[PDB]
Curated annotation (Swiss-Prot):
Residues 2-122 form the Ig-like V-type domain. It comes from the Eukaryota. Belongs to the nectin family. It is found in: Cell membrane. Can form trans-heterodimers with NECTIN3. Interacts with CD226 or with PVRIG; these interactions are competitive and have a differential functional outcome on T-cell activation, either positive or negative, respectively. Binds with low affinity to TIGIT. (Microbial infection) Interacts with herpes simplex virus 1 (HHV-1) mutant Rid1, herpes simplex virus 1 (HHV-2) and pseudorabies virus (PRV) envelope glycoprotein D. It comes from Homo sapiens. Coiled coil: none annotated. Disulfide bonds join C24-C106. Ubiquitous. Modulator of T-cell signaling. Can be either a costimulator of T-cell function, or a coinhibitor, depending on the receptor it binds to. Upon binding to CD226, stimulates T-cell proliferation and cytokine production, including that of IL2, IL5, IL10, IL13, and IFNG. Upon interaction with PVRIG, inhibits T-cell proliferation. These interactions are competitive. Probable cell adhesion protein. The gene is NECTIN2. Glycans are attached at N103. This is Nectin-2.
Length: 124
């Protein structure tokens, strides 16, 4: 099975007080691959601020960090089985503030390939 990779933008520029999307896609669309999880994290944020978003095929989306928090976040394309689709893990963030600036890491957990990740700088 071919190896997979994460595609993100080196930087995303969003308008202050507005909305911005952080693109993240698993490539290529390989048949036989199971995506068990995708997460977004801010490595440099305080402890309880690092886990910004997560998506599981069964349990759906979660946003543990209160900042930006679920109120300001959503996965634009990810679907949960009610079948799941996590290949596009693009994250939309509203009410952009300067305090939102920083490195964001998008990481897929997969079978059989394990984890792969990419990083994006968000500038306001």
């Amino acid at each position: 099975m071919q190896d997979v990779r994460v595609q993100v933008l080196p930087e995303v520029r969003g308008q202050l007080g507005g909305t911005v999307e952080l693109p993240c896609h698993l490539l290529p669309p390989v048949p036989g691959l199971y995506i068990s999880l995708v997460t977004w994290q801010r490595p440099d944020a305080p402890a309880n601020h690092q886990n910004v978003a997560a998506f599981h095929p069964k349990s759906g989306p979660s946003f543990s960090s209160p900042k930006p928090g679920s109120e300001r976040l959503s996965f634009v394309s990810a679907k949960q089985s009610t079948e799941a689709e996590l290949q596009d893990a693009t994250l939309a963030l509203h009410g952009l503030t300067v305090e939102d600036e920083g490195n964001y890491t998008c990481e897929f957990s997969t079978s059989p390939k394990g984890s792969v990740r990419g990083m994006t700088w968000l500038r306001v």
